[PDB]
Each structure stands twice: as structure tokens, then as C-alpha cells.
Amino acid sequence: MKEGFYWIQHNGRVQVAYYTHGVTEDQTIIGVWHLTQGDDICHNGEAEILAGPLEPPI
């Protein structure tokens, strides 16, 4: 529920993504996963949260 970086798994890919409370109206969902590679995805269960939010080192 907090904006930040998290380890997630999406289609078998373990990766770090950024989470924002972005609103996506197609049905409307709040929560967006910003990935390092690939299009953003709504927080609708396709991606599963493994850990986070990660504490930044500075």
C-alpha cells in the first residue's frame, strides 16, 4: 500500500519494480507496477509481491 521499490514476480520473472498509487481506468484499479523492462501493469494479481518496500541506502 506504500509507494516504493519492491521485489515482485510477474510471469516467472523475479525483479524489482516501482509501485505508485496510479489510477488506471479501463473497471478502474488503483496501484501501478512500473517495471525496468516492459509496459507498466495494474496491481491486479498478475504480479505477486515477494518483498518490500526496499529501504534505500541513502
CA distance 54 to 19: 11
Nearer Cβ to a second copy (18/31)? 18
CB of 54 to a second copy, least distance (A): 7
CA distance 8 to 27: 24
Interaction with a second copy in 1-58: which residues (CB under 8 A)?
A: 5, 7, 9, 14-18, 34-37, 50-51, 54, 56-58
* Cβ-Cβ contacts under 8 Å for 23 (sequence gap 6 or more): 29, 30
Question: Which residues form the interface with a second copy (CB under 8 A)?
Answer: 5, 7, 9, 14-18, 34-37, 50-51, 54, 56-58
